[PDB]
Design a protein around this nucleic acid. Structure first.
Lengths: 90, 51, 97, 157, 71, 49, 51, 164, 103, 89, 54, 146, 408, 266, 139
RNA sequence: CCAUGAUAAGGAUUAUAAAUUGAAAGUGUUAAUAUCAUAAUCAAAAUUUAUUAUUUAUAUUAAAUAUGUAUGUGUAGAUAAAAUAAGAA
C-alpha cells in the first residue's frame, strides 16, 4: 500500500499468492512461447547502415587487357571508393 | 646490508616498531566496507570454484 | 542471466558485468605432458628444466600441474592469447637448463 | 520545481540519483586519481629510464596536473552518505540502520520483511544464523572467506 | 586416537573438552565391545547433555546475558 | 481502429494507492527476447528477380 | 647478447617525456634536493613514504 | 644479525649453477613484479591466525599482512589495490534507483507503447483527484501558482475567462 | 497437448516434454562466438593492440594498465608546463622557515 | 485489465449441523484447545508426521513447516535401502 | 486566471466534465487511425458488419 | 508451433566445420545460400549485437510492428486474459468445496468443450464478441461474450 | 596406530591441501570414470533446496538422453574407422616432420604404423564411449541414484549454499539506542546451488548447442552457469620465444622497481628482425655464418634468389640463432657534414636533416630538443641550425642494429 | 494573484515553421498540457539555474572561486570576497587550461568512456545534453562556465529523465557514440581518411613496417584514433611474409575489414 | 542546541555507538590540542615529503574566494605578503590579522580553535543561563 | 506547523519431555482534511543535550587527521545487571 508501487517479480507475496505459482508446487515451464517464429518482424534499424556505399555505382567492368593498358590513364579516373583529385579538364 | 628476524625477545619490543592506530586497510578487502558490511557482488557460493 | 536482468535495458550492462566478472581463463598443463621428444631429437624438458620451471613458478605449479589464471583482459579471447604468450615465455625461460 | 506539481511523494528521493551519479564519477576518476597519487609520492626511483631530476620534475608536473584536474572525485566511499531508494531515509554503513545486500535502511527492511516484499528466511535472533562460516568464526571469518573466494582462490598469472 | 572437529583451539584443557573426549572414548568402547554398553549407560557415560553457551546478541551489553543501563 | 487494443490499466482511482495490486505484469522468463529476423516483400521480390 | 632484448631502450622514454628534458635544459635544473641539510640527524623524524 | 648478503657468481664458483637471485630476477622478468628494496629482512611474519590449523579461523591463505603502518596513501597499497570499476559498486550505482520501472525502461515510452499516453505517478493522480473533489464544493481555498507566469499575465487576445 | 486432465486435475509434469524443449530451443538464436573454433595460431603482436574502439582492455589492478600509464605520462608531460608546476612546494621546504623546523 | 487476473473469488467450506462449542490465561487463538489439552503421554511429542526432514521445508512468512510434495508422505523405508539396519544406506 | 474550463472540478453544469484526463475510460487513449477517407462501410461505425465485408 | 524449425540451428555449426575443413563457402549454390542466410539471420546472433538486443526500444518497436500488422495474440505485455476455467465437482465426495492454489496461462486447447456437445462448428453460424459490461458488476464476468 | 605426527609436518600438509584446490587435471587419458576430452559443469542456482534438487534431476535426465544419442552417433562413426580407413598425406607429414627421432636419426613412419597409432587411439575412444553409454543406460525408475558417477551420467554433485544473515534494527524510536539494540532481528538470504558434471571423451559442438540452450526452459527462479574445461593444443616455438644465453650485463633489481612494468619493459615477445640486407663482401656461406644458420636452409628459405648481389634484401631463416633485434642499443647520430653539394660544410635547415634521416621534423625536435632550444632562426621566415650544435641525433624509429653491436 | 518561478520564456522553432504548423493540433500530454523545460528557459534564467547544479566548485555556490557577487551576507555578518589578485600573493597560481581537463582517447577506455574530467558527466550521444540544439561535446573548449548546455547535472530542471537515460546506458555506449559521430563515412563514398592531423602517424607506421619492426609498427598502430588508410594494412600484411606470421596477418585483415568500413578489402 | 537544516531531517538516536573512526559528521574539536614533542605529527600529513594539498593552490580562472579552506597549510607568503586571509568558523569567520612566523607549516584548522571557550551572554535564555550557572560556566 | 491508519521496548505461574527464557494493544519517516514555504550530506564543520559498560602505574603517537585531561583511604546520596556451559538450594 502507498504511492510507491509494488514490483510483483521481486515481491514474494505476489509470486506466492493464489494468482501465481507457490514454491511448494512443482516449478516447471508452462505453455512454452514462440513469438519470433509465428510472426518475425523484418530488421528495420533506427540508425542508417553505417557501411553503406551512399553513392551511385557505375559497374565498371572491362576486358583485363584494356584495363591494364589504360591503367596509366585510369589512375586519374575514380576507382572503387577511391577518388583522385585530378583536374577534370586533364 | 639487512637484518634477520630477531632471535631474542627483548629486541622485538625494544625496537622502533609502531602499533596500529587508524583503520586497517587491505589491498583488496577495502572494497568490502567492513566485516559487518560484507559487500558481495554476486550470490555465489563461498566454496565456489572457477575452472 | 534469464531470471532477471534480461530483455530490457538491464541486460545490456548486466551481460557485460557478468563477462568481465568471468574474464578469468585458466590454463592447465601437466609437467609430465611436456616431457616428450622435441622435433630436434632431444627431450623437450628434462629433470633440470623441470626444476628450473618449478623454481620460476612458485605457486603457479602444483602436484605436477602448471596452472595460470589469465585475468588481464575482460574478453576471454584476449585473455587466452595473453595466457598462451606468458606460458610460452615461461617455458622458454625455463628451458635454459 | 519549488513543489509545484511534484510527482514523487518525497523530494529527497532525488538524492539517491545524485548518489548514483557521484558513484559514476568515482568510477571515472578512480584510476587517474590513484595513478597520480602513486606517482606523486614515490620517493624511490621509478626505473633506470627516469632517475633524479627527470623523476622529481615529472612528479611535480603530474601533481600539478592532478591539482588542475577540476572535479576529480577525491572523496572516499565510506564518507558518502547512504540514503534509501524507497523512502529516502539516511543510514550509515557499519551500524544496524543499514543492510549491505539490499541497500535499504533498517526501517525499510523491517517494513518489507513484515509485509511480503522481500524473500528472506527467519533465524534465531540471538544466534549465528545457519551459515557454516558465521558459526565458525563470525563476521570477520565470513569476510575473509569472501576475500578467499574472490581473489586468493586464483593462482594469478 | 582422538581427532578434533568443529571449532579448533590451541589448548583445549577445559572441562567441556574433557567431557567431550570422555563421551567419544565411551562411544568407541561401546562400539568395540557390545556388553560394555550396560555399565556406561547406567553410569551416564553415553548420555549427551544438550546445554550450550548462549549465542551472541548485540542487544545485550556484553552481547550474551547482560542488558543495558536503565534510568 | 483495432479490436485488440484494449485497456491494460484500470481507470484512475484510489485503488491504485490503497491496494497492493501490482501495476504491471511480472516478467515471463520462458518467453524469449523479441529479435528481428524477417524479410520484407520488396526484398523477397528482388531476390526472386 | 650484451643486453636483454625485452628491455626498453632509454630513447623511448626520452621521446615519451621529450618536453621534460627541454624544460630542464631551459631552466638549468642542476639538481632538486628532497631532504634538508641535516635530515640524517633525526631518522625517525621524516620517514619518507617508502621506508 | 646485521650483515651484507653476498652473491657468489657461478663463474667464480668451483662448479657453476643457477643462483637463486638470478632465478628470482628471471621470475620478475617473466611476471612483472616489484622488488621492494626497503623491505626489511627481519619483518617476515606469518599470519598464524589464518595460516595455522590450530585456530578455528584457519583458512590456509595470508588474509592480512602484519604491518601496523600499512595504510592506503602509500603507492605499495595503490599498485596492488583493486579498482572499483565493474564491481558491486558498479552494480549498486545502476540497479538501485527510486523507480525500478524507470530502471528497466523509460516510463514515457512504456506508457506510449502499451497504454495510450503518458500516465502520471500515483501521487500526481492523488493530487488531481483531490483537486477535482475539492473544487466542486468551493473555489476559495485554491490559488494560482505556475512555472511561467508570463502566459497568465499576458493572455492571448481571444482569452475571456467565464465568470462564475 | 493431448493431456485433457492438466492443471485442473492436479497434473503438473515432473519433466519438461521434448516438444516444449524443442520449441524453446528454436525460439532463440545461437551466439556465433560460442563455437570457439580455432585453426591458426595466436597473434602475439597485433591481437593485443588492435584498434582503440575494440581494443583489448586491461581490467582491474593498475599494474595491468602498462600502456595506459605510459600514455598518461606522455600526455601529462606534454601538457603541463614546468614553469607552472615548479610552484608546488613540499612540507619540509615550507617548514624550513619555522623558528623550530627540526627536532 | 492487468487487474482482471486478481479477480477470481473463493468460497468458504460447507459446515454441517451446529457449530463447534467451546469450553463453557488469555484465550490464545493459535493453540488448538482440545489437541493441546490432549495428554502428551498418548499423543506423543510430535508436531508433524514422523517423516524424514528431507521431505519437510521450513516455510516463508508462516511460523510452521510445510511439505513440498503436498500430503504425499514417503515413509522412512522409502529413502533407506530394502531391509536396512537403522535405515542406514 | 482560473476558469471553469481550466480548473479540475469533476462536475461542470451537472454533467461529467469531459476535460479531465482521469474522467475517460482507458481504452479511449489507445492509438487509432483516421478512417473517414476510406470506404463508407470500411469505417469504424460498422464494427458489427466488419466481419461480413466482401 | 512447429518443432522441426529447430533443425536450422545446426547450420552455423556446419559452416564452422566447413571453415575448419577448408570447404569454400561461396561454392554453394545461390539458391541454397539464400536459405542458408535465412537460417543464419534466424540463429546466428553475434556477441556484439547480443550485448544490445536486450533493451526497451527494440522490444517496443517489435510490439508496434505487431500492432500495425494486427497480430497481438502472442505478446506477454499487450495481452490480458479474462477467461477463467472453474473446478470440476468430483462425485467421490461432493460435500467438500475446492479453492484454487495457483494460476497458469494454459493455451485453452488443453481443456476444450468436446465436439459432440458443441454447436455446429461454432465459427460461421455464430459470431461471438467478448466485450465488457458498463454496469456495476459487483462480482462476476466483467468481460462477457455475446 | 595410534597416529603421532610432527607439528611442522601437520602444518605443511594442511596448508598444501588447502592451496592445492584447483590443481587437478580433469581431462586425462585414464580409462574409466576419470579421463575425458572435455568436461562441463552446470551450476544451477535457485531459492529453494527442493527446487534445485528437482531441477537437477530434470536436467540430468535431459543430458542423459542427449549425451546417449551423441555418444552412440560417435560410436557408430568410430566403428567405421576401426573397420577400415586411409591415412592422409598431412598426417604422414605430421608424423615424419621431425628432424631426428628418438633413435638419433630421421624417422620414417609408414602407412601401416600411422594407421596402427590411429587405430589404437580409436580403440581407446571406443571403450570410453561404451563406458559412457553403459553409465547412461544404468539409471532406472526403480532405483535412480544420480549422486554417484558409476550408476549415473551425468552424475550430480552438491555445493555449499550461499547463506547471508542480515542483522538490523526493528524499532522506529529516534531516542532510545538501548531499545533500538534490544529490538535487533536476524533474517537471512539463501541461494541453493547444485552442480552437474559431464565428462565427454570427445569435443562435440552438438552437445554444447544442446547444453547452452537449457537456460531458456529452466524452471521458475533458477539460473545456471556453464564451466567448460576443454583440452586445447597450444604451439610453443623457439622462433619467437628462443632459449638464448643470459645477457652479458645481467639485469638487476633496479630494472624491477615500481612502474618498471611500463617504464623500461615492453610486452613479450620482443621482435627479432626476419629480414636482412646483404653487403658487397658476402656470399651464401658468409651470410649463413653471419646469421648463424645453415647455408642450405638459408637458400631454401630464400627459394627464389640463385645468386647474391650487393645491397639486396633477403629473408632471414626463422630458425637462425643470431637473428638481430629491432632498434639496436647503439644510438644513431647524424653528422653535421653535408656529404653532398647542398652546403658543403653543415646542414643548414631542419628540413634537410629530416630528408636525410627520413623522419618527421617534429620527431627530430623531440628526439634531442637542444637544437630546438638553441635554434638560431630569424623571425622573418628564416630558420638556421645553431652553430653550437656539436652533433644531431637520429630518432629511435630510424635506428639500425648489427651483429657486432648487438652480440658481446 | 498569479505567481511564477520564471517570468519570461522563449520558443524553440523560429518564425519560419510555427506559423504554418499551428493549424495542425498537437496531442499534448493529457495531465499536463503546458510544459516548460530547460531548453525553453531564457538565457539569464538558464545560466543561473545551471550554475546552481553543482554542489560546490561551481558558479552557483557562493564560495567556489567562480562567484561574481561583490559581497555575501553570512550569519547576519557581511563579508567581502578576496579578489584573485590578492589571493595570488599567497596562493601559487597553477593553471593549464582546458587541455588539463580533457584526456586522450587511449585513456578513455580506462576512464570508462569519459575523455573529460569536468565534474558534470559529458555524454557523446545527442540526447542527454539535449538543449534546443543537439548535444555536441567540445574538447579544447571545455570550461567550468560551460556555455553550451552539453554536460549533465543533477539539480537543473527536467533532469530526472536524463539521469535515468544516462544510468541505463548500454555497454560501450559512450565509446560507440564517439566512434559513430566522429568516424562517419563520407557522403561521396570516399573513406574518412586523409586527415591532416593523423597523417604523420601513417607515415611513421609505413616506415616502421618497411623497416621490418612489425612489433613497434603495431604498437604505434594502436595509437591511431581515426581509420588508417589501406597503405598501413597492406604494409603490415606484407611484413608477415618473411616471418610466416599468418596469425598476425589474419588478425590485421580482420581488424581492417570486419570493423573499419572494409578498408582492408584490397 | 545546534540549529541547522539537518537537525530536523536526522535524529541523534541518543548516545548511539558508531564504528571506530566512522562518525557521520566529523567535528575535529581536538585540532587545537597542543603537543610540543608531537608538533609535526599531530593533525598534519604523516610524511614530510608530501606536497601541500590542492586546497592551498588556485586551479582555474577564479574570480575570488571569500574564505580559504581549513586544510590549507600556513606558509611564509601568508605572513610576508600581508594579504587578507580568512577561514570559515563558528560563528562566521576567523581572519588572520596577526601574521606570525611560529605557525608556518601548520594547518589553519589546527591553528583555529573549533570549540571556543567564550560563551555569549546575550542569546542565552533565562533557563539556559541558570543551567550554565549551575554547571559553573557562568557566574 | 498541520496535512487520518502501520511493525518497538516492556520477564511473576500450561515444568522436563524425543522442546526455545522475549509479549499485539505500539514505537520519527508509510495510503484521502491542504492553500506565500527552494531549508538535505558528494567530505575536513558549532556539547547543554534523560536513556551511555573506557584502556589504572615494567617497555606508550608510522600513514586518510583522530582527543591536554579529573593522581587524591575501591571513598556521600541515588541507582544498574544476572539463577540459560555452567558451578549459588
Amino acid at each position: 500500500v502507498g504511492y510507491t508501487p509494488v514490483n510483483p517479480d521481486t515481491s514474494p507475496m505476489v509470486a506466492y499468492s493464489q494468482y501465481h505459482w507457490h514454491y511448494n508446487l512443482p516449478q516447471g515451464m508452462e505453455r512454452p512461447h514462440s513469438v519470433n517464429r509465428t510472426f518475425a518482424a523484418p530488421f528495420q534499424s533506427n540508425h542508417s547502415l553505417v557501411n553503406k556505399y551512399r553513392g551511385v555505382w557505375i559497374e565498371f567492368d572491362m576486358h583485363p587487357a584494356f584495363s591494364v593498358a589504360l591503367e596509366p590513364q585510369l589512375r586519374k579516373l575514380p576507382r572503387g571508393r577511391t577518388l583522385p583529385k585530378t583536374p577534370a579538364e586533364e | 646490508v639487512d637484518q634477520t628476524p630477531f632471535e631474542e625477545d627483548q629486541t622485538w619490543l625494544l625496537h622502533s616498531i609502531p602499533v596500529q592506530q587508524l583503520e586497517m586497510h587491505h589491498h583488496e578487502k577495502d572494497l568490502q566496507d567492513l566485516p559487518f558490511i560484507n559487500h558481495e557482488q554476486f550470490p555465489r557460493s563461498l566454496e565456489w570454484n572457477a575452472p | 542471466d534469464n531470471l532477471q536482468y534480461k530483455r530490457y535495458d538491464w541486460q545490456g550492462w548486466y551481460q557485460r558485468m557478468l563477462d568481465v566478472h568471468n574474464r578469468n581463463v585458466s590454463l592447465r598443463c601437466r609437467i609430465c605432458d611436456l616431457q616428450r621428444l622435441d622435433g630436434n631429437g632431444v627431450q623437450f624438458v628434462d629433470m633440470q628444466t623441470e626444476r628450473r620451471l618449478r623454481i620460476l613458478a612458485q605457486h603457479r605449479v602444483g602436484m605436477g600441474v602448471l596452472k595460470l589464471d589469465a585475468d588481464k583482459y575482460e574478453d576471454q579471447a584476449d585473455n587466452v592469447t595473453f595466457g598462451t604468450t606468458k606460458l610460452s615465455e615461461l617455458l622458454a625461460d625455463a628451458r635454459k637448463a | 520545481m519549488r513543489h509545484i506539481g511534484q510527482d514523487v511523494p518525497k523530494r529527497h528521493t532525488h538524492f539517491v540519483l545524485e548518489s548514483r551519479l557521484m558513484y559514476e564519477k568515482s568510477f571515472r576518476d578512480c584510476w587517474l586519481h590513484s595513478v597520480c597519487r602513486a606517482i606523486s609520492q614515490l620517493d624511490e626511483p621509478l626505473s633506470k629510464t627516469v632517475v633524479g631530476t627527470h623523476q622529481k620534475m615529472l612528479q611535480r608536473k603530474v601533481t600539478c596536473f592532478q591539482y588542475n584536474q577540476y572535479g576529480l572525485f577525491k572523496t572516499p566511499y565510506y564518507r558518502l552518505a547512504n540514503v534509501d531508494r524507497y523512502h529516502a531515509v539516511q543510514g550509515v554503513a557499519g551500524t544496524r540502520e543499514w543492510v549491505p545486500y539490499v541497500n535499504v535502511s533498517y526501517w525499510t527492511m523491517n517494513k518489507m520483511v513484515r509485509g511480503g516484499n522481500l524473500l528472506v528466511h527467519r533465524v534465531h535472533y540471538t544466534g549465528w544464523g545457519t551459515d557454516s562460516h558465521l558459526k565458525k568464526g563470525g563476521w570477520e571469518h565470513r569476510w575473509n572467506k569472501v576475500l578467499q573466494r574472490n581473489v586468493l582462490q586464483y593462482s594469478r598469472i | 586416537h582422538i581427532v578434533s572437529e568443529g571449532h579448533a583451539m590451541p589448548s583445549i584443557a577445559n572441562e567441556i573438552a574433557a567431557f567431550a573426549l570422555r563421551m567419544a572414548v565411551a562411544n568407541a568402547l561401546v562400539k568395540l565391545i557390545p556388553l560394555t554398553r550396560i555399565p556406561l549407560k547406567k553410569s551416564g557415560l553415553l548420555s549427551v547433555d544438550r546445554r550450550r553457551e548462549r549465542g551472541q546478541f548485540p542487544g545485550y551489553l556484553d552481547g550474551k546475558k547482560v542488558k543495558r543501563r536503565f534510568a | 481502429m483495432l479490436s485488440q487494443n484494449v485497456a491494460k490499466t484500470t481507470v484512475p482511482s484510489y485503488y491504485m494507492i490503497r491496494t497492493n495490486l501490482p501495476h504491471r505484469k511480472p516478467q515471463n522468463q520462458w518467453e524469449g527476447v523479441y529479435y528481428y529476423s524477417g524479410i520484407t516483400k520488396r526484398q523477397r521480390h528482388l531476390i526472386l528477380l | 647478447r650484451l643486453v636483454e632484448p625485452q628491455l626498453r631502450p632509454q630513447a623511448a622514454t626520452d621521446a615519451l617525456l621529450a618536453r621534460t628534458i627541454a624544460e630542464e635544459e631551459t631552466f638549468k635544473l642542476k639538481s632538486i634536493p628532497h631532504l634538508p641539510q641535516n635530515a640524517e640527524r633525526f631518522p625517525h623524524e621524516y620517514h619518507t613514504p617508502t621506508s | 644479525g646485521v650483515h651484507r648478503v653476498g652473491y657468489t657468481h657461478p663463474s667464480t664458483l668451483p662448479v657453476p649453477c643457477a643462483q637463486r637471485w638470478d632465478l628470482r630476477l628471471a621470475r620478475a622478468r617473466i611476471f612483472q613484479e616489484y622488488i621492494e628494496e626497503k623491505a626489511p629482512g627481519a619483518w617476515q611474519l606469518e599470519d598464524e591466525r589464518s595460516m595455522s590449523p590450530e585456530f578455528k579461523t584457519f583458512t590456509g591463505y595470508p588474509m592480512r599482512d602484519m604491518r601496523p603502518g600499512y595504510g592506503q596513501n602509500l603507492p605499495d597499497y595503490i599498485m596492488k589495490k583493486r579498482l572499483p570499476n565493474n564491481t558491486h559498486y558498479e552494480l549498486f550505482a545502476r540497479r538501485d534507483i527510486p523507480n525500478e520501472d524507470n530502471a528497466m525502461y523509460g516510463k514515457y515510452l512504456y506508457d506510449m507503447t502499451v497504454h495510450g499516453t503518458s500516465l502520471p505517478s500515483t501521487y500526481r493522480m492523488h493530487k488531481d483527484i483531490n483537486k477535482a473533489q475539492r473544487n466542486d464544493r468551493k473555489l476559495s481555498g485554491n490559488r494560482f501558482k505556475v512555472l511561467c507566469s508570463s502566459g497568465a499575465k499576458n493572455p492571448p487576445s481571444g482569452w475571456e475567462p467565464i465568470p462564475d | 497437448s493431448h493431456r485433457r486432465d492438466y492443471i485442473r486435475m492436479g497434473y503438473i509434469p515432473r519433466y519438461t516434454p521434448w516438444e516444449w524443449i524443442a520449441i524453446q530451443e528454436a525460439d532463440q538464436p545461437l551466439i556465433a562466438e560460442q563455437i570457439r573454433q580455432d585453426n591458426i595460431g595466436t597473434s602475439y603482436f597485433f591481437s593485443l593492440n588492435r584498434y582503440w574502439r575494440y581494443k583489448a582492455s586491461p581490467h582491474g589492478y593498475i599494474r595491468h594498465f602498462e600502456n595506459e600509464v605510459r600514455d598518461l605520462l606522455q600526455y601529462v608531460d606534454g601538457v603541463t608546463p614546468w614553469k607552472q608546476a615548479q610552484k608546488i612546494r613540499t612540507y619540509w621546504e615550507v617548514r624550513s622557515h619555522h623558528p623550530m623546523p627540526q627536532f | 485489465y492487468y487487474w482482471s487476473r486478481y479477480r477470481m473469488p473463493t468460497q468458504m467450506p460447507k459446515f454441517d449441523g451446529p457449530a463447534p462449542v467451546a469450553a463453557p490465561t488469555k484465550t490464545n487463538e493459535f493453540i488448538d484447545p482440545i489437541d493441546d489439552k490432549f495428554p502428551m503421554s498418548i499423543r506423543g511429542p510430535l508436531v508433524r508426521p514422523d517423516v524424514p526432514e528431507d521431505q519437510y521445508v521450513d516455510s516463508w512468512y508462516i511460523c510452521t513447516s510445510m511439505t513440498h510434495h503436498m500430503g504425499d508422505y514417503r515413509p522412512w523405508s522409502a529413502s533407506a535401502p530394502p531391509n536396512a539396519f537403522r535405515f542406514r544406506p | 486566471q482560473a476558469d471553469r474550463r481550466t480548473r479540475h472540478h469533476m462536475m461542470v453544469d451537472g454533467q461529467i466534465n469531459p476535460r479531465e484526463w482521469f474522467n475517460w475510460h482507458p481504452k479511449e487513449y489507445q492509438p487509432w487511425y483516421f478512417d473517414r477517407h476510406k470506404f463508407l462501410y470500411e469505417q469504424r461505425q460498422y464494427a458489427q458488419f466488419h466481419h461480413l465485408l466482401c | 508451433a512447429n518443432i522441426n524449425v529447430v533443425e536450422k540451428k545446426k547450420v552455423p555449426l556446419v559452416l564452422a566445420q566447413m571453415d575448419e575443413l577448408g570447404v569454400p563457402r561461396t561454392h554453394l549454390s545461390r539458391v541454397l545460400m539464400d536459405e542458408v542466410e535465412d537460417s543464419l539471420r534466424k540463429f546466428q546472433t553475434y556477441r556484439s549485437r547480443f550485448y544490445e538486443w536486450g533493451r526497451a526500444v527494440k522490444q517496443f518497436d517489435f510490439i508496434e510492428f505487431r500492432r500495425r500488422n494486427g497480430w497481438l495474440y502472442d505478446l506477454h505485455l499487450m495481452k490480458c486474459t479474462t477467461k477463467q476455467v472453474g473446478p470440476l465437482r468430483d462425485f467421490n465426495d461432493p460435500d467438500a468445496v475446492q479453492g484454487a492454489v495457483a494460476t497458469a496461462e494454459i493455451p485453452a486447447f488443453f481443456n476444450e468443450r468436446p465436439a459432440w456437445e458443441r454447436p455446429p462448428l461454432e465459427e460461421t453460424l455464430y459470431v461471438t464478441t467478448n466485450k465488457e459490461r458498463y454496469d456495476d458488476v459487483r462480482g462476476g464476468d466483467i468481460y462477457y461474450d455475446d | 596406530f595410534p597416529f603421532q605426527w610432527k607439528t611442522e609436518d601437520w602444518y605443511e600438509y594442511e596448508v598444501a591441501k588447502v592451496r592445492n584446490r584447483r590443481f587437478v587435471f580433469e581431462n586425462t587419458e585414464e580409462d574409466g570414470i576419470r579421463g575425458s576430452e572435455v568436461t562441463y559443469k552446470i551450476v544451477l542456482e535457485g531459492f529453494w533446496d527442493h527446487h534445485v534438487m528437482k531441477l537437477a534431476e530434470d536436467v540430468c535426465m535431459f543430458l542423459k538422453d542427449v549425451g546417449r544419442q551423441i555418444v552412440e552417433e560417435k560410436l557408430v562413426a568410430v566403428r567405421r574407422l576401426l573397420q577400415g580407413g586411409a591415412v592422409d598425406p598431412e598426417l604422414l607429414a605430421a608424423f615424419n616432420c621431425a628432424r631426428a627421432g628418438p633413435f638419433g636419426g630421421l624417422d620414417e613412419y609408414d602407412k601401416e604404423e600411422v594407421a596402427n597409432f590411429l587405430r589404437s587411439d580409436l580403440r581407446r575412444l571406443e571403450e570410453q564411449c561404451l563406458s559412457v553409454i553403459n553409465r547412461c543406460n544404468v539409471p532406472v525408475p526403480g532405483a535412480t541414484n544420480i549422486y554417484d558417477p558409476h550408476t549415473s551420467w551425468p552424475h550430480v554433485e552438491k555445493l555449499e549454499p550461499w547463506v547471508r544473515m542480515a542483522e538490523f534494527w526493528t524499532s522506529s524510536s529516534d531516542t532510545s539506542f538501548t531499545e533500538l539494540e534490544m529490538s535487533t532481528a536476524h533474517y537471512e538470504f539463501r541461494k541453493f546451488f547444485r552442480v552437474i558434471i559431464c565428462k565427454l571423451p570427445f569435443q562435440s559442438t552438438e552437445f554444447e548447442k544442446r547444453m547452452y540452450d537449457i537456460r531458456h526452459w529452466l524452471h521458475r527462479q533458477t539460473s545456471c552457469e556453464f564451466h567448460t574445461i576443454y583440452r586445447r593444443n597450444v604451439i610453443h616455438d623457439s622462433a619467437v620465444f628462443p632459449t638464448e644465453h643470459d645477457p652479458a650485463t645481467p639485469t638487476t633489481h633496479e630494472h624491477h622497481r615500481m612502474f618498471s612494468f611500463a617504464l623500461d619493459w615492453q610486452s613479450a615477445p620482443v621482435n627479432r628482425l626476419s629480414t636482412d640486407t646483404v653487403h658487397e663482401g658476402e656470399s651464401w656461406d658468409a651470410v649463413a655464418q653471419r646469421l648463424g644458420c645453415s647455408v642450405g636452409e638459408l637458400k631454401d628459405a630464400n627459394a627464389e634468389r640463385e645468386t647474391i648481389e650487393a645491397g639486396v634484401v633477403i629473408n632471414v631463416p626463422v630458425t637462425a640463432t643470431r637473428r638481430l633485434t629491432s632498434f639496436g642499443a647503439t644510438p644513431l647520430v647524424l653528422p653535421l657534414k653535408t656529404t653532398s653539394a647542398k652546403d658543403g660544410e653543415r646542414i643548414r635547415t631542419w628540413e634537410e636533416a629530416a630528408a636525410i634521416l627520413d623522419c618527421t621534423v617534429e620527431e627530430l625536435q623531440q628526439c634531442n630538443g637542444h637544437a630546438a632550444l638553441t635554434y638560431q632562426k630569424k623571425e622573418s621566415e628564416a630558420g638556421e641550425f645553431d652553430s653550437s650544435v656539436t652533433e644531431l641525433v637520429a630518432p629511435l624509429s630510424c635506428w639500425t642494429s648489427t651483429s657486432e653491436s648487438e652480440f658481446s | 494573484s498569479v505567481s511564477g518561478v520564471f517570468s519570461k520564456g522563449r520558443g524553440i522553432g523560429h518564425e519560419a515553421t510555427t506559423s504554418i504548423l499551428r493549424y495542425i493540433p498537437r496531442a499534448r500530454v493529457p495531465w499536463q498540457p503546458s510544459r516548460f523545460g530547460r531548453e525553453n528557459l531564457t538565457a539569464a534564467d538558464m545560466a543561473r539555474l545551471w550554475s546552481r547544479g553543482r554542489y560546490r566548485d561551481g558558479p552557483g555556490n557562493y564560495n567556489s572561486g567562480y562567484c561574481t557577487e561583490r559581497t555575501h551576507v553570512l550569519e547576519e555578518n557581511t563579508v567581502s570576497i578576496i579578489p584573485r589578485r590578492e589571493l595570488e600573493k599567497y596562493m601559487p597560481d597553477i593553471t593549464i587550461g582546458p587541455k588539463a581537463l580533457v584526456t586522450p582517447v587511449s585513456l578513455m577506455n580506462a576512464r570508462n568512456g569519459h575523455r573529460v574530467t569536468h565534474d558534470l558527466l559529458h555524454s557523446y550521444d545527442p540526447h542527454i545534453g539535449r538543449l534546443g540544439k543537439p548535444a555536441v561535446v567540445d574538447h579544447d573548449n571545455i570550461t567550468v562556465e560551460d556555455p553550451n548546455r552539453v554536460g549533465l547535472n543533477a539539480a537543473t530542471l527536467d533532469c530526472r529523465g536524463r539521469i535515468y537515460r544516462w544510468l541505463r546506458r548500454g555497454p560501450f555506449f559512450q565509446v560507440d557514440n564517439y566512434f559513430r559521430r566522429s568516424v562517419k563515412l563520407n557522403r561521396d563514398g570516399t573513406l574518412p581518411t586523409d586527415f591532416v592531423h593523423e597523417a604523420p602517424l601513417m607515415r611513421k607506421i609505413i616506415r616502421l613496417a618497411h623497416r621490418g619492426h612489425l612489433k613497434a609498427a603495431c604498437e604505434e598502430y594502436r595509437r591511431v584514433t581515426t581509420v588508417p588508410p589501406v597503405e598501413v594494412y597492406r604494409a603490415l600484411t606484407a611484413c608477415c611474409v618473411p616471418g610466416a606470421k599468418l596469425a598476425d596477418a589474419v588478425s590485421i585483415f580482420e581488424d581492417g575489414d570486419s570493423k573499419l568500413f572494409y578498408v582492408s578489402r584490397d | 542546541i545546534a540549529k541547522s537544516a539537518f537537525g530536523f531531517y536526522l535524529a541523534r538516536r541518543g548516545q548511539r555507538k558508531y564504528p571506530f573512526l566512522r562518525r557521520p559528521h566529523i567535528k575535529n574539536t581536538h585540532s587545537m590540542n597542543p603537543s610540543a614533542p608531537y608538533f609535526w605529527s599531530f593533525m598534519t600529513a604523516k610524511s614530510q615529503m608530501a606536497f601541500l594539498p590542492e586546497e592551498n593552490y588556485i586551479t582555474g580562472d577564479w574570480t575570488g574566494k571569500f574564505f580559504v579552506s581549513k586544510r590549507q597549510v600556513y606558509t611564509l607568503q601568508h605572513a610576508t605578503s600581508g594579504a587578507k586571509v580568512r577561514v570559515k568558523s563558528f560563528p562566521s569567520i576567523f581572519e588572520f590579522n596577526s601574521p606570525s612566523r611560529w605557525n608556518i607549516g601548520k594547518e589553519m584548522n589546527t591553528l583555529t580553535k573549533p570549540r571556543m571557550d567564550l560563551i555569549d551572554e546575550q542569546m542565552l535564555t533565562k533557563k539556559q543561563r541558570l543551567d550554565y550557572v549551575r554547571a559553573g560556566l557562568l557566574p
